[PDB]
Design goal:
R2_ABCA1-4-like; binds a molecule of 5 linked components (NAG-NAG-BMA-BMA-BMA); 68 helices; glycoprotein; binds a molecule of 2 linked components (NAG-NAG); binds 2-acetamido-2-deoxy-beta-D-glucopyranose; translocase; alpha/beta; eight-stranded mixed β-sheet; phospholipid transporter activity; binds cholesterol; ATP hydrolysis activity; four-stranded mixed β-sheet
């Protein structure tokens, strides 16, 4: 067992090594594949991003100044990387260093101090008292000095105007300006015709200035926009008035220019020519007042000297420069605010007019969002207590509403300032909050009393490695490309070893399939294990899977190799071809791997039971293992031994076992075309008996085989010599019989019997890529010989073969057929086998190699029990020693040759070469004589039987010159006798005949290639049902802003400063019966979301044993209240950070709020740290369970705490100081007061929102607005039915968006066109494989012999292909028109597409014609043609994703590209017409336009034309004195030496075409047609009549026989039946001369004689025939004028007997008498030329050369010695033609 496996592995390794054409590519393909993989990996480095927070944004309701400050500077998500103070629950500032807020505070302080100051009245009273020393004068002067000091202090202690002046003088290199603006505004980290061109050029410079152009995108819809609303309902009018007021709150700069123009002269004269200023300047400079000013200044800067220099200046810095600078600043701000539109309110009567006006303003590039209410009627009723409003804006400023989530999860906070922040800079949230606050003010009455802020939740320290995620999850593709190459190669090898009948030869040699399968398993693992190790080390070195142990991936790759090896072992027993299996294995594996990519997309509702029942394949299990590896690798921890993967390995081993048992079942239930599905002479006892059969029988004989005699075994192959030879071997078991093979029964022991019993079947065994020496060594080792024994056997075989040279012993299987047959028959004798069973030797070999192999078998007659089994008669006569013929399953005759010849055989045959005189002489000499056969210059007679021989020969020799007899001959009876005794309009006729034959071969192909009609049909059906799934990608439905759009979410409410000031009732109403928003309140006004009613429990989740360590780790202050969580250590790439438990610190009290969600109280806890820790730990815990983790929390609220005095002060100040009622003084003061009282906020709420949710911030804003509404409602019946709902619905698409969606949709069109191209490329494949099947000498050349006009044949093929493609064309047309695809089923697009498909077929059917010319193999062009068609289609599709003009002009040669471009332009025009009809216009451009579609049609037409012309062109491509005369009825057989060019001469020698018939050596008949139809079609093409066709067919079917099987498939016939069909074809037209070639090839007796009778009958009618073959018996029995050509020239000509007597050898004699040496001595002394050819017991034979003329004396001596030598039997024969042939070939 072990030595056999050793020989098997050695043979497999030698096969793998001797190729040198497959293993190098096998080992190089994975290198290139993974090199491309490592290159595309190294091109994408991993992106690392530290954890960061985001500043809080301010809404317009929380103050105009903070809103503007949040818009301008901090609107880019700077990611400070540290917790900003804005995220603190107490402070809502972050504008502490902003000089604008400081300046506003100092201005407010100046106002509130000047209103309560009385320095003006005090100074006026002091001046009046001084103008009208004293006692009260001192007190008055002291009061005036104190008042002046207070005014000086008020002018000081502000430090804002100085900084503003410094900044405005510095502003009037790129980083410096940005830093200056950032320090000024906030803290530290065609248009010219509309309005004036000043701010137009300003905004142009802003857009062209080199900085972050994001603030302009937010400031454009702020002062250029315009909002429009519903009809003029009084309530809508009131809310619009409130919105206008909250906009104009910032209009204090509009009426400031008039105030400055009115107040400039007054302050000018007050500072120039006022007595108060002079008195102040005089009192500021004195001898005692200086100390007072120094004491009042408190050591501050700008002492009294600087004050006197600044104020007291009649003519370096005085008040004049300050006045000029303030005037310039006011002028600049007025010119800036001039073109600012603050009246952006326009009412509309209806809704369609609203849409039209919004579009019109969109063309004007000035249009903000628009509010659309849902009023029931324009009545005086305020509100229906439920406000439903929508906000319609442009699509480029609002997030898409067709999707609410990114779909696949991916790390990243999603905080881009422009790409995914349209709800901030677009103005959606601002206007939404403004409208909501206006509604709150108009419903209840409260004005604001509320601030709102938005805070984005931070992200916990991720890294961006999406490439690793997409590569490690798509590992099997590039992991198994090279392994698909390997499995294809190994499948090719296996099926090649199987098809050559090598497995059957190994089985009959005494081997089982188990050891063969095991050896193939090992020889397929070894290279697979090597490649697995190489891929493991190249993946460990590639740095793409770090921290991964090589052992686990190595064992995974090895078990995957094992399961794939057993999978291909299962798949191999289904195919029966080398290239076919090698090509279809890859596509079958792809189709069975496609389930993986099919199931990975629908993982949402996949079950574990479904996963188990679907994991029966190896690719899906490998994909599950790769997903496990990815999930354990992405987190940086890697995969190690930690006890999923084990389930995947278990399923893989179960799959291996299932594949093994399936292989074991299929190898037995369905085998190939060769497997098995589950007058007796004296017995010479001089030698030993080797095999003695006894009672041989089967399911519906006894012969004793001898040792030293070469016995024969003849039969009809139907009743014997076929089942008996199989029962004698180990193929089939016996049935009530016995066979003692060398003293061992067959049924008793079968192993020891096969150890010394060789076999040699008809199919020779010769492994390729190997030498004959390796073959001999392997066979000797398999026999069981030792090393020296095998060497001696190989030396003996090399010495006895005849090729003892290194040129032949070290060469591969490149010898001729004769040498191959000789070596294959010599292999069966290696090993010293005592019993050999040959099978059909010398089938079609030349007579020289036949004599060689005969001498070879004769040299091995030293007791080897040679059992011959062949159909040849002369071979069995010369080789067989004991001829045994059986019939009907029983023994009939047995005995030697001469015994069977003289017992029941016919008498002698006397022939004469060149008739009544000779016949009369023969009748007078012998009474029993008769005339047997007389042919051209030849006659023969029979002598059935003895002194008449001498007298007859004397009379023949004496009267030889009397008649025309030129030479005589005598012969004995051959074994075949005993065998048979015992057991013009012709063009149209050819056209219609071709069409009829083609229709018959196509209609009878229901079981054959019939899939070429329904396979493209189902492919196009799948194409359409897949195209009816992708959304139009151009829809935007109306979505209601509500936070419950997601499945599950976690909210929270953080109550800061619980002092019951204004925050208690707010959170209360937030957590009352109505809940968060409008989910359920006296009904469910939200579709498909019924809320749960019964739930009320304030409990804490069960905490594990983690609070103990928190207790022993006490002193957890507000700063750092939880243990740290590390990040991205060196050389450790971690996607999500991990750290020990205790991340949150304490489980907050969880409670459900009856809205399908649960909230937790976070009062007094660090919000940012807790949120980060909880989020990261929950994401990790959810990802650990293989759930495809989604988002966890979306939003939460934090309530906290942050007037009329300033308004009363402004009113009191405006009442005095020259009050008036003009529109330039009172309006400015009123606006200033309103802006002052519109910035204070009592309480505020901060909404923490996650930017991953597309509609999260707006929904929570609406929720908090509804909560504020329910809290502000007082003295109401119930807050249930008081709620506000917000909607989001963009406007209609314009021409730009329509063009965008028409240009972007080309992806679905190209992907639906590629597949339909692939489906339509299947029709010509059947035509090409049909032409290939009938191209290899089957029907092309045979029809080309006779007059066929091959151009007409090509025309017929073309028209049949057209009419056979018409049917599937309209079939698929009605298929894809049955569906409602308006882009194809319209009345103007159906005929153009139909004709496009028609011309595409017309242009593709000739293109695949020349690919069939040079292709010498059938049933394999299908896959390569489909592959090249797919490649051409892919190239043409990708070539349209771009120099484009010349590209599309030159790429029109491929019809696939033309069809793709036509479909693309057709669907593009359909979409364009649809968009233009939707917009309100019409276009009727015809698709038949020569520029668009119609150039491709004419191109395909002319291309098909030129392809047909060039295919007709390719077909046309633009011996030594051979002299012989063939008269009427002269069978002139022209034989020749091996390699004399007989086929070339026959092709060269072939009016003359129609008068000549040809018979091919190989079978030429259709596999699916009928023989009668074959002969009918051939009679039609021959030129017979249309009415006499049936009679000619019946005559042809009755002449050649086989009438019982005349109506049947020709492919299901046998070899002899095919030969009969071919020789009937050779006479279908009835030519005067017909050329035959090997009429009998592997046939059986009782049928060759029939063909010979038909041949002699057709040549007897005066029609000469020409034939040639290797078997000399056929020509010696049929040919009458032989023509032997040695080298190019006819070396011998004449009759058969004349040539055999002229250059042939002498006669042969056989005498039968233990024995006596005296008889042999007398025989040797009587003839001088006597030679002992063979010496046996009581049977001698001799040969007499150069003694043919003395036959009479020889017969006389024989008759005289019959009584002296006591001879029992005598026989005399002549030399046959084979001796003459081998003599002519020997001396050559
Ligand atoms: C909730 O929990 C988070 C953490 O989980 C807390 O955040 C901690 O507290 C501060 C933020 O609120 C952070 O302090 C900052 O730390 C920066 C780090 O710089 C180094 O710090 C180490 C000490 O860790 C020093 O030895 C080094 O020398 C560095 O200074 C400081 O740079 C930063 O200092 C600021 O610098 C800017 C720019 O120069 C100044 O303008 C500013 O005035 C200030 O000086 C500041 O000290 C702290 O790192 C952060 N994390 C930790 C682990 O403590 C929240 O505070 C918690 N919430 C509440 C309400 O407390
Ligand atoms: C809405 O507000 C705008 C300004 O915020 C008002 O327009 C003012 O009044 C007339 C136009 O109506 C102009 O002459 C003024 O220059 C505008 N600006 C100012 C500051 O007065 C408009 O009147 C308001 N409309 C309603 C219905 O209140
Ligand atoms: C209510 C508040 C927030 C609005 C007023 C903010 C003021 C102080 C800011 C906002 C816009 C700023 C102006 C923007 C444009 C220009 C034009 C430039 O050539 C000179 C500076 C100047 C004139 C800036 C001066 C300061 C400015 C007017
Ligand atoms: C600046 O921050 C300090 C911190 O204590 C605070 O007291 C002060 O009011 C802030 N200034 C503002 C908000 O203008
Ligand atoms: C906008 O699109 C809707 C969608 O059907 C349509 O009903 C409406 O008429 C369109 N309006 C305009 C002005 O095109």
């Amino acid at each position: 067992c072990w030595p056999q496996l050793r020989l098997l592995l050695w043979k497999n390794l030698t096969f793998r090594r001797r190729q040198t054409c497959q293993l190098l590519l096998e080992v190089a393909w994975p290198l290139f594949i993974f090199l491309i993989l490592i290159s595309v990996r190294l091109s994408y480095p991993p992106y690392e991003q530290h954890e960061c927070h985001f500043p809080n944004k301010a809404m317009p309701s929380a103050g105009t100044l903070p809103w503007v400050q949040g818009i301008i500077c901090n609107a880019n998500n700077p990611c400070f990387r540290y917790p900003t103070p804005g995220e603190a629950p107490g402070v809502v500032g972050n504008f502490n260093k902003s000089i604008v807020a400081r300046l506003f505070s100092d201005a407010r302080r100046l106002l509130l101090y000047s209103q309560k100051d009385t320095s003006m009245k005090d100074m006026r009273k002091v001046l009046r008292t001084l103008q009208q020393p004293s006692k009260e004068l001192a007190e008055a002067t002291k009061t005036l000095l104190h008042s002046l000091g207070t005014l000086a202090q008020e002018l000081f202690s502000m430090r804002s105007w100085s900084d503003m002046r410094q900044e405005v003088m510095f502003l009037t290199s790129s980083t410096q300006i940005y830093q200056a603006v950032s320090r000024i505004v906030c803290g530290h980290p065609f248009y010219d015709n509309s309005t004036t061109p000043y701010c137009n050029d300003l905004m142009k410079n802003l857009e062209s200035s080199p900085l972050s152009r994001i603030i302009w995108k937010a400031l454009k819809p702020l002062l250029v926009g315009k909002i429009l609303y519903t009809p003029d309902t009084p309530a809508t009018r009131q809310v619009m008035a409130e919105v206008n007021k909250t906009f104009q709150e910032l209009a204090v700069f509009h009426d400031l220019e008039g105030m400055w123009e009115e107040l400039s002269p007054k302050i000018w004269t007050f500072m120039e020519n006022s007595q108060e200023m002079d008195l102040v300047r005089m009192l500021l400079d004195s001898r005692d007042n200086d100390h007072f000013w120094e004491q009042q200044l408190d050591g501050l800067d700008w002492t009294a000297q600087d004050i006197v220099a600044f104020l007291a200046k009649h003519p370096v810095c005085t008040w004049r420069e300050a006045f000029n600078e303030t005037n310039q600043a006011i002028r600049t701000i007025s010119r800036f605010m001039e073109c600012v539109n603050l009246n952006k309110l326009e009412p509309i009567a209806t809704e369609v007019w609203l849409i039209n006006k919004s579009m019109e303003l969109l063309d004007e590039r000035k249009f903000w969002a628009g509010i659309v209410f849902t009023g029931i009627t324009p009545g005086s009723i305020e509100l229906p207590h439920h406000v439903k409003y929508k906000i319609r804006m442009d699509i480029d400023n609002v997030e898409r509403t067709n999707k609410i989530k990114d779909g696949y999860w991916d790390p990243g906070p999603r905080a881009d300032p422009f790409e995914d922040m349209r709800y901030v800079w677009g103005g959606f949230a601002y206007l939404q909050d403004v409208v909501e606050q206006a509604i709150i003010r108009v419903l209840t009455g409260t004005e604001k009393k509320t601030g709102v802020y938005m805070q984005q939740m931070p992200y916990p320290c991720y890294v961006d490695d999406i490439f690793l995620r997409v590569m490690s999850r798509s590992m099997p593709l590039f992991m198994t490309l090279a392994w698909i190459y390997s499995v294809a190669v190994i499948i090719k090898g296996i099926v090649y070893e199987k098809e050559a009948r090598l497995k059957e030869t190994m089985r009959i040699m005494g081997l089982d399939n188990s050891i063969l399968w095991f050896s193939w398993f090992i020889s397929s693992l070894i290279p697979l294990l090597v490649s697995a190790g190489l891929l493991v080390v190249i993946l460990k070195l590639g740095n793409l899977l770090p921290y991964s142990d090589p052992s686990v991936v190595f064992v995974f790759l090895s078990v995957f190799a094992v399961v794939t090896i057993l999978q291909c072992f299962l798949i191999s027993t289904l195919f029966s071809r080398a290239n076919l299996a090698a090509a279809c294995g890859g596509i079958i594996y792809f189709t069975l791997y496609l389930p993986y990519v099919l199931c990975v997309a629908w993982r949402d509702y996949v079950g574990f039971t479904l996963k188990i029942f679907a994991s029966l394949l190896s690719p899906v299990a490998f994909g599950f293992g790769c997903e496990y590896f990815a999930l354990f690798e992405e987190q940086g921890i890697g995969v190690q031994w930690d006890n999923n993967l084990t389930t995947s390995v278990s399923m893989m081993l179960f799959d291996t076992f299932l594949y093994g048992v399936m292989t074991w079942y299929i190898e037995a239930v369905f085998p190939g075309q060769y497997g098995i599905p589950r007058c007796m002479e004296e017995e010479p006892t001089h030698l030993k008996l080797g095999v003695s059969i006894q009672n041989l029988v089967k399911v519906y004989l006894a012969l004793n085989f001898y040792e030293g005699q070469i016995t024969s075994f003849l039969g009809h192959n139907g009743a014997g010599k076929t089942t008996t030879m199989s029962i004698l071997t180990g193929l089939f078991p016996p049935t009530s019989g016995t066979a003692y093979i060398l003293g061992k029964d067959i049924r008793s022991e079968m192993s020891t019997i096969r150890q010394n019993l060789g076999v040699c079947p008809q199919h020779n065994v010769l492994f390729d890529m190997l030498t004959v020496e390796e073959h001999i060594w392997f066979y000797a080792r398999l026999k069981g010989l030792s090393e020296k024994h095998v060497k001696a056997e190989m030396e003996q075989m090399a010495l006895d073969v005849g090729l003892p040279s290194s040129k032949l012993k070290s060469k591969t299987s490149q010898l001729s057929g004769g040498m191959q047959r000789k070596l294959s028959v010599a292999l069966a004798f290696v090993g010293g086998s005592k019993v050999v069973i040959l099978d059909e030797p010398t089938a079609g070999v030349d007579p020289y190699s036949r004599r060689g192999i005969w001498e070879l078998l004769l040299k091995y007659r030293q007791g080897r029990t040679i059992i011959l089994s062949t159909h040849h008669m002369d071979e069995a006569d010369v080789l067989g020693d004991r001829i045994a013929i059986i019939s009907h399953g029983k023994l009939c005759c047995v005995g030697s040759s001469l015994f069977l010849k003289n017992q029941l055989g016919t008498g002698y045959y006397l022939t004469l070469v060149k008739v009544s005189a000779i016949s009369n002489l023969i009748r007078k000499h012998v009474s029993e004589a008769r005339l047997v056969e007389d042919i051209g210059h030849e006659l023969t007679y029979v002598l059935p039987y003895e002194g008449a021989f001498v007298e007859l020969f004397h009379e023949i020799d004496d009267r030889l010159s009397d008649l025309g007899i030129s030479s005589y001959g005598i012969s004995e009876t051959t074994l075949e006798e005993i065998f048979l005794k015992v057991a013009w309009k012709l063009t149209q006729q050819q056209f219609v005949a071709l069409l009829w034959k083609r229709l018959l071969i196509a209609r009878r192909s229901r079981k054959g290639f019939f899939a070429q009609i329904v396979l493209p049909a189902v492919f196009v059906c799948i194409a359409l049902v897949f195209s009816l799934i992708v959304p139009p990608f151009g829809k935007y439905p109306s979505l209601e802003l509500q936070p419950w759009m997601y499945n599950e979410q976690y909210t929270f409410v953080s109550n800061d400063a619980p002092e019951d000031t204004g925050t208690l009732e707010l959170l209360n109403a937030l957590t009352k019966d109505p809940g968060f928003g409008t989910r359920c309140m006296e009904g469910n006004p939200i579709p498909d979301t019924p809320c749960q009613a019964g739930e009320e429990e304030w409990t804490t989740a069960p905490v594990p044993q983690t609070i103990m360590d928190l207790f022993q780790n006490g002193n957890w202050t507000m700063q750092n209240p939880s243990p740290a969580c590390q990040c991205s250590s060196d050389k450790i790439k971690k996607m999500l950070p991990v750290c020990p438990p205790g991340a949150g610190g304490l489980p907050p009290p969880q409670r459900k709020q009856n809205t399908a969600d649960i909230l937790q109280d976070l009062t007094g806890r660090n919000i940012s740290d807790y949120l980060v820790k909880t989020y990261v730990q929950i994401i990790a815990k959810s990802l650990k369970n293989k759930i495809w983790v989604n988002e966890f929390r979306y939003g939460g609220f934090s309530l906290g705490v942050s007037s009329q005095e300033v308004n009363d002060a402004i009113k009191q100040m405006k009442k005095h100081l020259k009050l008036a009622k003009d529109s330039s003084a009172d309006r400015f003061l009123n606006s200033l007061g309103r802006f002052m009282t519109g910035l204070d906020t009592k309480n505020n709420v901060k909404v923490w929102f996650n930017n991953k949710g597309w509609h999260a911030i707006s929904s929570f804003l609406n929720v908090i607005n509804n909560a504020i509404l329910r809290a502000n409602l007082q003295k109401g019946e119930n807050p249930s039915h008081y709620g506000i709902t917000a909607f989001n619905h963009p406007l209609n698409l314009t021409k730009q968006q329509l063009s965008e969606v028409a240009l972007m949709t080309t992806s679905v069109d190209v992907l639906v066109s590629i597949c339909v191209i692939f489906a339509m490329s299947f029709v010509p494949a059947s035509f090409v494989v049909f032409l290939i099947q009938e191209r290899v000498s089957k029907a092309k050349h045979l029809q080309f012999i006779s007059g066929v006009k091959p151009v007409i044949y090509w025309l017929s093929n073309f028209v049949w292909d057209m009419c056979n493609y018409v049917v599937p064309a309209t079939l698929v047309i009605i298929i894809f028109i049955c569906f409602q695809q308006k882009s194809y089923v319209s009345s103007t697009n159906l005929p153009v597409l139909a004709l496009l498909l028609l011309l595409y077929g017309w242009s593709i059917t000739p293109l695949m014609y020349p690919a069939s010319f040079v292709f010498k193999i059938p049933s394999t062009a299908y896959v390569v043609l489909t592959s090249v068609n797919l490649f051409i289609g892919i190239n043409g599709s990708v070539a349209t994703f771009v120099i484009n003009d010349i590209l599309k002009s030159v790429f029109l040669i491929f019809p696939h590209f033309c069809l793709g471009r036509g479909l693309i332009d057709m669907v593009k025009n359909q979409a364009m017409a649809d968009a233009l009809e939707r917009f309100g216009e019409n276009r009727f451009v015809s698709p038949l336009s020569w520029d668009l579609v119609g150039r491709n049609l004419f191109a395909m037409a002319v291309e098909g034309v030129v392809f047909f012309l060039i295919t007709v062109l390719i077909q046309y491509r633009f011996v030594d004195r051979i002299c012989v005369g063939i008269p009427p009825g002269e069978c002139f057989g022209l034989l020749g030496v091996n390699g004399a060019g007989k086929s070339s001469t026959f092709k060269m020698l072939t009016e003359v075409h129609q008068n000549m018939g040809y018979c091919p050596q190989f079978d030429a008949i259709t596999e699916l047609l009928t023989g009668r139809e074959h002969v009918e079609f051939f009679a039609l093409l021959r030129g017979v009549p249309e009415k006499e066709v049936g009679k000619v067919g019946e005559w042809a079917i009755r002449k050649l026989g086989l009438v019982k099987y005349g109506e049947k498939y020709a492919g299901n016939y046998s070899g002899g039946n095919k030969r009969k069909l071919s020789t009937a074809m050779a006479l279908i037209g009835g030519p005067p001369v017909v050329f035959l070639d090997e009429p009998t090839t592997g046939m059986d007796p009782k049928a060759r004689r029939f063909l010979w009778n038909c041949a002699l009958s057709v040549v007897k009618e005066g029609r000469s025939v020409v034939l040639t073959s290797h078997s000399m018996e056929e020509c010696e029995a049929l040919c009458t004028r032989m023509a032997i050509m040695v080298n190019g020239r006819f070396r011998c000509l004449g009759s058969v007997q004349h040539l055999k007597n002229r250059f042939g050898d002498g006669y042969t004699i056989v005498v039968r008498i233990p024995d006596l040496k005296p008889v042999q001595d007398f025989f040797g002394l009587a003839f001088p030329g006597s030679v002992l050819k063979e010496k046996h017991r009581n049977m001698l034979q001799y040969q007499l050369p150069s003694s043919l003329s003395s036959l009479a004396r020889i017969f006389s001596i024989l008759s005289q010695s019959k009584k002296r030598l006591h001879i029992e039997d005598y026989s005399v024969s002549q030399t046959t033609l084979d001796q003459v042939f081998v003599n002519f070939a020997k001396d050559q």
